[PDB]
A paper describes a structure:
Yersinia outer protein M (YopM) is a major virulence factor of the three pathogenic Yersinia species, Y. pestis, Y. pseudotuberculosis and Y. enterocolitica.
The asymmetric unit contains four molecules equivalent to two biological assemblies each represented by a dimer. Analysis of the interaction interfaces between the four YopM molecules indicated that two YopM molecules mutually interact by binding of the C-terminal LRR 20 (residues 461–481) of one molecule to the internal LRRs 14–17 (residues 342–422) of the other molecule. The total interface area comprises approximately 1010 Å2 and is mediated by 21 hydrogen bridges. The crystallographic dimer fitted the experimental SAXS data reasonably well (χ2 = 4.3), which could be further refined to a nearly perfect fit (χ2 = 2.3) by using a rigid body modelling to slightly change the angle between the two YopM molecules. Altogether these data indicate that a dimer represents the smallest biological assembly of YopM and that the dimer creates an interface that allows binding of one molecule of DDX3, thus forming a 2:1 YopM:DDX3 complex. It appears that the YopM dimer forms a binding interface for the DDX3 fragment. YopM's highly conserved unstructured C-terminal tail is not part of the previously published crystal structure or the novel crystal structure obtained in this work.
Author numbering:
A (entry chain A), B (entry chain C): 34 to 481
The structure:
Amino acid sequence: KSKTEYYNAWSEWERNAPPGNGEQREMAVSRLRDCLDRQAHELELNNLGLSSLPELPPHLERLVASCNSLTELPELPQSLKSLEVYENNLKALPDLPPLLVDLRVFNNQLEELPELQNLPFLTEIYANNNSLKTLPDLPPSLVDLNVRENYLTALPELPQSLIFLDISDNILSGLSELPPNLSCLDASRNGIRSLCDLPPSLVYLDVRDNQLIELPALPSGLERLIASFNHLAELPELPPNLYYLDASRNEISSLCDLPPSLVDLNVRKNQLIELPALPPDLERLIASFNHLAELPELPPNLSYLDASRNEISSLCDLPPSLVDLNVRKNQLIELPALPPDLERLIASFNHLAELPELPPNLSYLDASRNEISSLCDLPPSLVELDVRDNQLIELPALPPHLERLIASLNHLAEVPELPQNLKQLHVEHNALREFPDIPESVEDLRMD
Amino acid sequence: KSKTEYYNAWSEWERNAPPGNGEQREMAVSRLRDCLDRQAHELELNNLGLSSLPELPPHLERLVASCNSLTELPELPQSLKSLEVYENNLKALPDLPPLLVDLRVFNNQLEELPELQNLPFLTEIYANNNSLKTLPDLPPSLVDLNVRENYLTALPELPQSLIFLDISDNILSGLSELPPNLSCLDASRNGIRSLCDLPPSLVYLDVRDNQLIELPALPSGLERLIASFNHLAELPELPPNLYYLDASRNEISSLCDLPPSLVDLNVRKNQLIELPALPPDLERLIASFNHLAELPELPPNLSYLDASRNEISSLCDLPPSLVDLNVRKNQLIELPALPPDLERLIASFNHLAELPELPPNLSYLDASRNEISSLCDLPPSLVELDVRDNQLIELPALPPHLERLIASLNHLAEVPELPQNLKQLHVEHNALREFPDIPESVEDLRMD
């Protein structure tokens, strides 16, 4: 086509929008002409509310037409190197030109993709969030593939060249093989029943929410493993570079040894009776919802500990690095000395008769559902106090920066003078002979 | 005298400003010279962190030097019409020039003000938040005075010309007779024991948090009255233009008639046994913490009602305009039909056996501490549900956009499948035969 032949086709397309609607076709034709006149490489038509596109200017390398309401596309020029048409209503794509490198077609209604095996320059496909039931055979040199949130039931052969692969939230039931250069795999939210070998190049592996009984041998290179919400009976041996492990909501009976590189562990909601020796550099331990009789000696750098919902009868020495401690629902009769930098303590649902001396940086304290007869002095740093369901007849003087006081289901005869910036006061089910004066600041009051 | 004499004084003042250097003196001398060179009216030196100012350019009308660390000021030029030096550390002011019109010296440590009676052009003084024990005699033509947050124990004579007056948060115990043009008075947070006469021109009156037994006659012009936190036994007759009344936290035994112009009423925390007939155009009624046996018929436009902490045994017809209803802590055995546009219902602490059909726009529901045996169907609009302390054995299907579920202290045998974006689940003290699966989303969990 000559130059004025395009000008006609585009001015004709400009009228096929009915007079008075949301489409900025006049702005689009302005850009189409500017692009043709200057032989520009890029053409961006995004956020103009288009239902269709006219014949595209040839000799362009990049077409961005995302965030519109397109139903299909016109044939693509042969010079085209990248295509960005995400956030549209595309049910299918045209045939793709040979020089193509990027394909971004996520957030559409694509039911199929065109033939991909003959686009050797195509290195990135983001076709996530579509209605794809199946993938055609992939390009030779594909580096990045994202096809999450689709209805895939099986996978084609994956290239040697492949590095990043997201196939999560599909209907996969197995993975036959992975390429040797894959460094990052997300296969969450499928129905996968078994993995085959993992390549040594792998460093991030996320298989959350599948139906595994066991994992294959893990690469020594592997750094982060997420294997939550499966039916794991045990973990395989863990590599020496693994620093983050989440194996929660499985049926693990016992852990193998943990490497010294491990800094973050989560084995919540399993069948553990005991933990093995924790590594020195561990900073975050979650071991809730298990059957723990006791914890092993805690490492010097541990800063967050959640050992709730267990049957721990005795709590060992707490390291000074600890800042967040939760031991709700255990068999505790006493807590040990609380470390100075502690900020949040949750020791509810045990058999405590009293609390240790509270450290001076404690901002949140929940010691409800114990048999506590009186409260030790409260630090001024305290903002939230929950001591419902205990054996209290009186509360100590309340710190001035307290915002929430919950002390219902006790035997309180009176409440102390209330802080002037208290937000919440819950003292139902008590023996109050006199009700306190309520600050203007309290917005959520329950009493008597 | 001359131009280069100022240039010297300012370059001398520029050296020096230790601890070198929290002060932008070089930027300030730049503006001082630009101001002198161009004979400009304004000079702004705010947010430059100055500890002092040098000799000012004469022939300027406006000096803005707020948000600095000034301890005193240089003598002010005679041409000066306005002064803005708030947010500083001024302990005193210089003598003020005759042509002055605005004085903004709030947020300082001023212990006294200079002689004001001889500045006839001075029409606005904002000297609030200082350490003033006393005011000098005021200008003849003063229109606006703000001296809130000071240590005043008495007031000088107020001009005829005075319109707006804020004297709140001081140590006043009585009021020096008010001028006849005053349209707006705030005398909150003093120890005022008695008001004398209010001028007819008055339209806004705020005497919150004083020690009044009664109010003088109110002007017919009066539109908004705040008289909270006093010892009022009764209100005087209310004028026909009054649209906002807050008489909460007093000792009122009964209300007089309410004018039809009244749109917002608050008589919380009084000694009321009944309310009088509500006006048709009322939109907001707060009558909490009283001894109400029943409410009168509610007007068609009432949108917010808080009649909590009373002894109401029967609740009359609720108008469709109602959106926010709170009847916590009364003698209710049943609720009437809930209007369609209702969004928040709080009916906790009554004797309810069941709830009416919940309207479809209800987002927050608290029906705790009743004797409810089963819950009617919950609308999908519901985000927060509190039904603790009731006679429930099961919960209905939970709407999908529920974020908080509190159903502790019941007889629940099981909980329904939980919404996937639930934040809080509190179901302690129940009969759960099996515990539900906990979504990843729930961050605050309490259960048996």
